[model samples]
Target: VNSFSGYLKLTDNVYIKNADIVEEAKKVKPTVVVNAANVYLKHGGGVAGALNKATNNAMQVESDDYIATNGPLKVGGSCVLSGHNLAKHCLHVVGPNVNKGEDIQLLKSAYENFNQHEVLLAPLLSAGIFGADPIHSLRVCVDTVRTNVYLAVFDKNLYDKLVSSFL
Candidate 1:
């Protein structure tokens, strides 16, 4: 068994380093599991490369397995587009990096797409700006259109607090 440091280790033997645990787990049998750290949040969308180097590291493990977030979202690359995997389906949410109107349109489109799919898998929230302050943006978005808007907050507590002004 080989040991890794800081989620990234480079080795040329039967050692496992610089690989995604989830993906690696698929390849080999584990005699002992030492999950000293929570790796789930380490690699995912909305994470900056520098602050969350592990995020991109997760992507590097398997190009087809991981999705790019933030900077990766800004630039189209070889990897699969973010928000392409949900528990059962995939939904790609495309929105302008900075534009309230575009954000609303993207959300509406994502919501509509969700209705059509059997299992909503990847659902890219486009950019992080939307979550920065949901209330302010939602208000601006609603004023422009009268459509019933639904904001899907993965974390209920965070979402509730964000939109609490509406309450």
Candidate 2:
């Protein structure tokens, strides 16, 4: 039943997988899981929300506390927090709005901030409501991550399209 879907090796270590991101996070349990986030660090919807649910909703609570203490995250800024069950930490990255015109650099900045972890799990940053074209954002995400990576993408159509184009 799952025959048509699988992962594509991007580099020797990085792989783009067509799977539920929450499921992958549970299985792989990377040292750091990325929450493609907003400047306000709100985990209300999208991948952030999914991860918030995956972590028993404690993720949002931590994020709210962090924002109150540190103020709103700026575009390309990131913060690290304990992920409870999902991983040792969740790296929240505020991706750039695609309309800003410096999307690539800012998106790359998002990935670069938390590269010290050994196993890093991430979603396609800026590819959702932020309006980034996934193709370009995926490239930047892969290139900037210096650690072993699993790009756990849950969107099937987008994953299919990415495999066809990237391969």
Candidate 3:
């Protein structure tokens, strides 16, 4: 059992930690690993890039194939795809971009969509290049958690804030 540096047990099943989501996936082996993906499902940078790389880039191919068949994933919508490497299944979610007015409802749907999975390893959706406010993103993830969720915080500043505010 690997221990995280900043771990918070929010409930019996819900947890928060300051860690890389890719490493967490290897350790926890959740039912689903979430990618804060773009509408195009391109795994170019940020969380998507790391997860894609961890999967030996197979995840990107899956995303590409998916888009080729189904078109771009709609903002706030999601689709599950086969995982590779350390991940079992990967849920690619298209979050609302803040530059486009930060649709809170759409953002909520992205996190809420995790209800189907029992154990989920997810990053704070849309908090990176999509420009969602991290605090808002954290609240959505926390409030909407209905299953076992391990929230991975990649930055020290946000981790400290989460601990200070939530604990």
Reference-based TM-score of each model = 0.32, 0.87, 0.89
Clash total of candidate 3: 0
Residue lDDT tens for model 3, 82-140: 86875678888888888767686788888878888877778888887778778788778
lDDT per residue, candidate 2, 43-92, as tens digits?
88888888898878888888889889999988898888887788778888
Q: Which structure among the candidates has the greatest lDDT? A: 3
Displacement of residue 16 (Cα, Å) in model 3 is: 0.4
Ranking by TM-score: 3, 2, 1
Model 3: lDDT of residue 119: 75
| Tens digit per residue, CA lDDT, model 1, 55-148 | 3353334323443333333211111222211111112233333434334444433333333332221212332433424544334333432322
Task: Tell me the whole-model lDDT of each prediction, alpha carbons only.
Answer: 0.30, 0.79, 0.81
In candidate 3, which residue ranges exceed 4 Å CA deviation?
1-6, 100-102
**Best model per TM-score:** 3
lDDT of 3: 0.81
Better of 1 and 3 by lDDT: 3
